[PDB]
Amino acid sequence: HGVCWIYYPDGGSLVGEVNEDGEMTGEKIAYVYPDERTALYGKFIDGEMIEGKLATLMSTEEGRPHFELMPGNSVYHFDKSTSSCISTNALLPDPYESERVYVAESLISSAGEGLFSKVAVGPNTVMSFYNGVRITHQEVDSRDWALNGNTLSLDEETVIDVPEPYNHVSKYCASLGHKANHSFTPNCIYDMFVHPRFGPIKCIRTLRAVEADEELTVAYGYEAPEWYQVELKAFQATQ
């Protein structure tokens, strides 16, 4: 018996007692976010979330975690996207992300909406998640840029996208990573993340200290859209 903690490179973790087969299965398993405070407590089978409820990790005694459930009836489950399905509940936000970022008009002229921090945090802090449908590089690189505003490479085999009309918050808010604008002097980077609901995706992690209400930006790393080429020239100058 005993308790087992599995920490992912991104900071998140799975905690619980493994069954006779040594698998994280039961009604009291939990995924704990990188803040080591926010958690999804409930039913998991072999580490996969079946029915998790929002909870707060109060403390840990000799490896034993003590959770307190958050008021509400919102349950979460593994819900990895496909090429055509972005989410089973596109309007159910991620609790960890909801407490750290919000969408508003960007401070970047003519950029549209942007992603902003709700709190002051230090370097290397995971702030948002970049979930989306999963498609191939061939499909993406073979179509017009007008359709690739939200495409993000996950790896050599998969591209994550937030296609219309999901690029509108009123239609999709399960994750908000696609709302962060570009900057050649970014305060964040896209990083790998293993999410209990979204599965393998990317997240937005700060590179340094960020203040409350500061706009979060990332270097797109782009051949690229016109607005990008223009900004690039404007950057190479006055730099």
Partner: peptide
């Protein structure tokens, strides 16, 4: 090539 990296 037409995606963020």
């Amino acid at each position: 090539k037409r995606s963020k990296k």
